[PDB]
């Protein structure tokens, strides 16, 4: 074991294929959720697959959370979780049958079990649940949707982007029950597929969702949603689902709002609603600035990008469209300036370095990008 620091937390990680997983590259992901929790202030929270326990520990040390649950099915992880918790908190970690509880300023509950089992035991109990598995979160989604309060918050990560970006079509259908789209738009389509599957699974509980923040980064998808209580709210949520049509020869996309598509070659279903709560994300940029984060600079760069990013379905990739149409194109910075000069909204997007979010119709965009 070796000592490592992330944010205000000091933890021990196995030195090495490792007995307990820890990825420092995910410190940024952790920072983001920490920043968000400092805005929404959920009291009772769950770190469902904590591994070393770093997430829940940071929740306890850096957010207003009052009761923090850390869980993992692995005995090795559980043992390390207890050790790392006592490395950051004083008091008596009372253990009994695979569960250790510390009742200090903040109450910490370390659990050893299947996340589905723990969440089933804690029905309508958490104000916030963070699902951060190895790959897909689908094995845990339905139960989390029952474990969180009817107005709770859900944080979901999908690490395997192969099915979501269209590389593995078969798997995407099986796991997300949606038809993926490969290419320059896959980072967003995959993100919208994730939000859409959450909305779809939630509906049967007479719950709807409002997206707080959903983004893509370094080959992983993240989505934070606020559960809405009510059948009608569930109805209205499903009405925000839709499909995407994409022309491989031009890069032009079409949107179709509706539970089912009505034309061939449709992609989805996907969430066609907003991918961010403008006000909350605005506050997040400010909060990240007044907080001691693990990767403050990277956190702010991503948050600022998303904050200024136009929230509209999809975008146009200058490089990709140039290739599909077989034409020379202008630089992104120039194209944005030109679009704005013509009276159209246009911004860069975190989904792709060469992508441009704009209100401009496809044909106006093409005429603008042409060398
Ligand atoms: N059914 C299950 N219930 C609870 N944990 C599970 C599980 N199946 C797999 N896991 C596990 O999930 C892992 C995902 S790695 C997770 C990391 C993280 N949440 C962070 O920020 O560090 C392992 O620690 C592990 O044993």
Curated annotation (Swiss-Prot):
GO terms for biological process: tRNA N2-guanine methylation. S-adenosyl-L-methionine binds at residues 30, 55, 72, 114-115. The keyword Isomerase does not apply. Pfam families: TRM (PF02005). Gene3D superfamilies: N2,N2-dimethylguanosine tRNA methyltransferase, C-terminal domain, Vaccinia Virus protein VP39. Keywords: Methyltransferase, RNA-binding, S-adenosyl-L-methionine, Transferase, tRNA processing, tRNA-binding. PROSITE patterns: SAM_MT_TRM1. It comes from the Archaea. Belongs to the class I-like SAM-binding methyltransferase superfamily. Trm1 family. HAMAP family: tRNA_dimethyltr_TRM1. This is tRNA (guanine(26)-N(2))-dimethyltransferase. The gene is trm1.
